[model samples]
Target chain A: IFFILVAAGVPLSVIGSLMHWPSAVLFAVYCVTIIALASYMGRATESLSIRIGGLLNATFGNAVELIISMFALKEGLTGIVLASLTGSVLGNLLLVAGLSFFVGGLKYARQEFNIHDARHNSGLLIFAIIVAFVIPEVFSVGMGNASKLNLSIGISIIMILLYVAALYFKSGKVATIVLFAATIVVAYISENLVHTFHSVAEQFGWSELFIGVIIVAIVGNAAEHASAIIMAFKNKMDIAVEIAVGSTLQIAMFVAPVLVICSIFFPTSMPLVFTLPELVAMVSAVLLMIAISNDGDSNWFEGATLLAAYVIMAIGFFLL
Target chain B: IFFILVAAGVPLSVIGSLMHWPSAVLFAVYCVTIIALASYMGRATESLSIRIGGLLNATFGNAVELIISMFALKEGLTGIVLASLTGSVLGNLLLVAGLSFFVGGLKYARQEFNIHDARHNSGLLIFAIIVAFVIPEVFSVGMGNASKLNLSIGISIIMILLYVAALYFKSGKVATIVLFAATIVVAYISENLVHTFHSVAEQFGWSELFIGVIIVAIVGNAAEHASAIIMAFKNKMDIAVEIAVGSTLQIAMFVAPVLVICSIFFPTSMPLVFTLPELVAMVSAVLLMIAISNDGDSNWFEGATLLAAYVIMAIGFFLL
Candidate 1:
């Protein structure tokens, strides 16, 4: 059913626009396809978690969305790129994490995971994000021009290298073909999703920022979200949390810095500096997720809090 | 020792001002005195939670800050009043709750609490805050003057009545003299703390909004923060969660509404309308809390998340 939907989305995007179908229909179709792709990716990660481990699953799981973001970056859609970064982080932390916890909690009253590792990851997330964003912002204001780019590039390289080192040390498993095919399909659908999202935003007069942050970001992370939620439902909360938080970690450390590096090749340099609201949202989300995951236990409410934080950010973006 | 420190705050307030002492000295004295009062109140509630219950403990516990907010409301320091509301909610949820969880987590791997009632209270909190603030903002835009005030007053009365009904029927064991004396000293100390906070904010060139939301609010609710953290340390997480969350509920439902009703008598009305950031902070806090409490278990990470959220909001308030 999902494969059919994914295949259908491609034609629908072309035919739907050619035939002048309403953007909402395109939007709905795109949403369905993204979800389908996400579900497949989630299942893919299910096996992947056993083979490659949870953290790697999250890193690779974000690949589809990262590809889409790269496309956005190449277009100098910096706002969309930034918003998508915010969206993906918030989406996984709150939306994906929330659904998993809420559903998992309803099934089982209390869930526990690896507190030590969770806290370690959370600490790294907080430190990486604060240092990554704050230093750049401080430098942007206080330093010279060429130096700012040099500093951001250096920082980006450090972050990417850090992520790569973690992956290399942590790497395991195979099932490469299935994961590879799923990745390609997801990326394809994600591109259509982004295009439709743009049209839908234009059609409805919604801000691109809102669309990028909330809608596009979610669509991008749909796979990880699905996998995380599914893992929670299966009572594999450690894996669920790892998938969600790790994806968030990957986005902040891996995808974001990669974007900054890629931006140097773009027409306009995409600076590492985020808007005040974006910084506020990202920092808060990272901290809140750390707080949630650190103790290594969860229930529906914890998940709900994540969702609430996401909603708050979405509203903030909408208002902005 | 705590009693003497609490009592000395009053004389020091006058003497320090008369001698024209540096605001830093006054600030340090105020901080020390407030902490002393907080410690006493924490101990007071430690005993009181067993006798009078957590809800009432929180109610009376927050009386000091509630009184300060009322005073601010009467003087039409609307910004301070609003900031305090944000602060109290954030302080209880994050600062107190976070410290409790972090410290307790270090001592104990996991802490459990009553999930059912926690979620119920959290739901009420979400409902009360959304209704209390959202209605005012919407009405401010949509309705005529008298109608807006009328609606606000009506909402205020209903919230107070709802809180009363909950308390009245749910009421249990009471300890009068100790609770009463504690309340009086806390209120007195809170006033000096607020004055000193203002002087410090001025001297340091800190934003009043930041001071109000973070510092003054923390001082005002110092008693509850102390009590909640102490409860966590003692491994009475049920009471700890109750103290932190219950105070938040009271502020949103009881303190906030009562102020709106009281505003009717003030020379300038204290409208219930909050800035977007304030509403965002509050709604996010309540939801995050609800998420934390709903599944019925907690650890230090959850507490840290709460604190992180609070810090994020503080930064936001400062920037704004």
Candidate 2:
């Protein structure tokens, strides 16, 4: 299995290097194909084999994004980095997730999926975005230059809280302190990383918006893309859609604000500011999401809309 | 699959070696043995094919914990980390949550997890513990000395409102926001990492705890362990018991706090600031889990007494 995969990967790697396209795109295609292969193999297959397959495809997808971004970071081109991140977040939220759901189409029709939980989480995600946006403004206005405390921390706390609530809303209030704690740790790390990247950006005279876009958007969304495709390919379209869309909501509502709140504490007279252009992009994204999802049904058109929006945004940032 | 796990880990060689013993002592024996193999398999197979037998035994036994923990961070630590996390939380909370739940009793189960969410979240974990004990002291009595914004931000406006509401029995309106944003991104990262660990955590430290104990502790309980044991020694008489009582709940409640919360954000400055003693004890007991779980569950009498104090605390923490 390993050798077969490596053999297949070699050509793709060469192609990617030659064309200079981010290998992430190729690996993502690989993730979908692996799922198709496994499902074709049938259910009689060993559970471990299936899981290992899932792991490989998922890991491959994630590795692609992480690898591409390292070089972007090394080059110190903050705008392109942010553009990539923004594309990632937008892609996960709209394209992968939305498409997954549209394909799934409330299958089996039980509605066993809790709408209340969904509504609550939706509310939370939206609220997080608002808070994420607001906290940075507060920092920029309140602290002026010496903003040592990053808005990312506040955003992280908010995201953790939202995560806990999602479990409660979804699972009907089971004890999930474990999930909460784990969520907190990641949020903490991600938040701190945001602060670090911002610090690095400011020290080097780079762009904060770009940094946010790169770190949160691309890094954050890579998993969503792979996992969704994996699920969809495995014929678990419902879960695939749920996770995909759920993750999108998460990034928009939770991460956006985290950037803002953590920025408040940034030290060293940094701008600690997010531009109106970014806000327009964010608000447009959110509004577009609501417009797309409120129908209680999804289709390829909506997915295309999202993916296209991301493309346009990517182009906008890349050209600059 | 990509550069981060393989390349990043290249420089910091032997991180996984550091985690092995902890993986052995805490995860392998305690979680896999009883939960996956002894209890579940004992009920099913008495024998199996060599590869199946070997794989099952390896999986169901303490061995896989090492394999899994090494990769938990990448897998996002859901399956294994959740197991370890719940183990840790349950260990203390039964000391606290169980007691509270017991005091509240069947009646308290009706009282809403939200009420508990208020205090449990407010008082426990690194963030909460710091908020309750360390932050107050630093911001108030040691205000001038609390120079770092990491410290100051802990005492910010929204945070202050949080405690005030926690103190009074006021509506935890803020809790909703707190719970929303905090949970989503972390959830994304955690769930995403479930299969990606061997790729992620290998970058930092490795102490067996990183891979098997922490990740498996976080994600799927002992399902993987159970599978391995069945593969190894098919139809082991004790498989059922092992799987059921496996490290799922234990790590969920106990180990995760130590792994995620303590290691990352424990205020190293103050001698007793957040929870040095508790952290140490938790870390030590993980070894105990490794030892006990590897061998398998003890007699039913052991089970009865394991909850002797737990039963006592349940009455107070939950009922009254």
Candidate with best DockQ: 1
DockQ of 1: 0.08
What is the per-residue lDDT of model 1 for residues A4-113, given as tens digits with 9 covering 90 to 100?
A: 87687656756865775775787776666666666666566656665246355546667666777766765567778877887887787778887887788765456767
lDDT: worst 10-residue window of model 2 chain B: B311-320
Each model's TM-score, in the order given? 0.62, 0.33
lDDT of each: 0.69, 0.37
Isolated chain B TM-score per model: 0.83, 0.23
**Distance from true location, Cα of B265 in model 1, Å:** 13
Candidate 2: CAPRI quality band:
incorrect
